[PDB]
């Protein structure tokens, strides 16, 4: 049994009270207050549509993924990754795809900097999308479940889906459950073929074991995974530590 599996079982036994305290203990998070109010008033400039803009930025600012050229954003939801990439120098085009409808976030239209190179398309199930040519492949799909075996299956499905989109391009792909042995096996194969590394984003909540397979890095997958498991297990054992609050992204205005 994996360290991650022990973590999951412990997480599943928490009360909703214990869970709510745990989920943000010692994490980093952006202050969304300003953005949430502006969006409520239908402002279309400056604000990130979600916590996702800031999350992707953390990777980009550390050169783990360097968005360039034609960017595909699989599971774009409201569009946080898409809008953020649209303001980056090397990026020429952003195409976002998301399922929408009951239970799923719909793309939010914005006029943040570089909006004119973005197209977000709802009603698109990525498992039925043919792969297109692109220079950056982003994917943020993976729905949490109390069952790790369910999560294991969802994770493998994503990994099998993304592979045809990968051809010596930049990438950043969510791995919802990286600790189950079968996933590890797949990731090892994928790293051998396409390189990259798994990385834990500090803006991730303790309530999820998600890690991101980014293109620009090397290292041991198993080691990285166990380190996160250790971290998350330890964060059970301490009274809540309030999250480190950071300024949310300003995504600006106007065409490029």
What is the binding site for a copy of itself (CB under 8 A)?
63, 127-133, 157, 160-161, 163-165, 168-170, 191-196, 215-220
Q: How many CB atoms are closer than 10 A to CB 210?
A: 21
Q: List binders of ligand QAP among 125-164 (CB under 6 A).
A: 143-146
95 binds ligand SAH (CB under 6 A): no
- In sequence order, the β-bridge partners of residue 139 are 74, 173
Is 212 within any annotated ligand binding site? yes
Pick from 6, 200, 205, 256 the residue near ligand QAP by CB under 6 A. Answer: 205
**Residue 102 binding target from ligand QAP, a copy of itself, ligand SAH, none, CB below 5 to 8 Å by type:** none
Nearest residue (CB) to ligand SAH, 213 versus 229: 213
CA 76 to chain centre: 10
Q: 217 near 196, Cβ under 8 Å?
A: yes
Q: Say which entry of ligand SAH, ligand QAP, a copy of itself, none residue 207 contacts (CB below 5 to 8 A, set by partner kind).
A: ligand QAP
Please choose which of a copy of itself, ligand SAH, ligand QAP, none residue 76 contacts, taking the beta carbon within 5 to 8 angstroms, the exact cut-off set by kind. ligand SAH
Query: What 3-state DSSP class applies to 32?
Result: coil
92: nearest Cα among 109, 72, 112, 117: 117
As measured in angstroms, the least distance from the Cβ of 139 to a copy of itself is 12
The span of 61-69, 81-89, 122-130, 205-213 binding ligand QAP (CB under 6 A) equals 205-213
Q: Residue 170: beta bridge partners?
A: 136
**What mask of x and - would describe binding to ligand SAH in positions 11 to 50, judged by CB under 6 A?**
---------------------------------------x
Among a copy of itself, ligand QAP, ligand SAH, none, residue 217 binds (CB under 5-8 Å by kind): a copy of itself
DSSP 174-202: EES---SHHHHHHHHHHHHHH--EEE--T
Size of the site for ligand SAH (CB under 6 A): 22
81 is in an annotated binding site: yes
Q: Which does 105 bind (CB under 5 to 8 A by kind): ligand SAH, a copy of itself, ligand QAP, none?
A: ligand SAH
Residues 6+ apart with CB under 8 A from 113: 86, 87, 251, 252, 253, 254, 256
The answer to whether residues 52 and 81 touch, using CB atoms and an 8 Å cutoff, is yes
Query: Any idea which residue has 């890690």 for tokens?
Result: 211
CB distance 85 to 24 below 8 Å: no
The Cα 73–Cα 7 span in angstroms is 30
Which residues bind to ligand QAP, rule: CB under 6 A? 11-12, 143-146, 205, 207-208
Q: Which residues are annotated as a binding site for S-adenosyl-L-methionine?
A: 50, 80-81, 98-99, 125-126, 212
């Amino acid at each position: 049994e994996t360290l991650g599996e022990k973590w999951k079982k412990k997480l599943n036994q928490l009360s909703r009270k214990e869970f709510d305290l745990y989920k943000k203990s010692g994490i980093t998070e952006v202050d969304r207050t300003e953005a949430k109010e502006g969006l409520k008033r239908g402002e279309t400039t400056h604000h990130a549509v979600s916590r996702g803009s800031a999350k992707l930025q953390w990777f980009v600012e550390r050169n783990m993924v360097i968005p360039e050229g034609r960017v595909i954003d699989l599971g774009c939801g409201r569009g946080g990754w898409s809008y953020y990439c649209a303001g980056l120098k090397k990026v020429t085009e952003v195409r976002g795809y998301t399922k929408g409808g009951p239970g799923h976030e719909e793309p939010v239209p914005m006029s943040t900097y570089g909006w004119n190179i973005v197209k977000l398309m709802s009603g698109k199930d990525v498992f039925y999308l043919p792969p297109e040519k692109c220079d950056t492949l982003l994917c943020d799909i993976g729905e949490s479940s109390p069952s790790p075996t369910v999560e294991e299956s969802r994770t493998i499905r994503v990994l099998k889906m993304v592979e045809p989109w990968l051809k010596n391009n930049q990438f950043c792909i969510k791995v919802l459950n990286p600790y189950m042995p079968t996933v590890i096996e797949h990731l090892e194969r994928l790293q051998r073929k396409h390189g990259g590394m798994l990385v834990r984003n500090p803006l991730s909540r303790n309530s999820t074991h998600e890690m991101y397979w980014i293109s620009n890095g090397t290292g041991n997958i198993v080691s990285s995974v166990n380190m996160v498991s250790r971290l998350l297990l330890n964060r059970f054992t301490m009274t809540h530590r309030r999250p480190t609050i950071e300024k949310d992204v300003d995504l600006g205005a106007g065409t490029r």
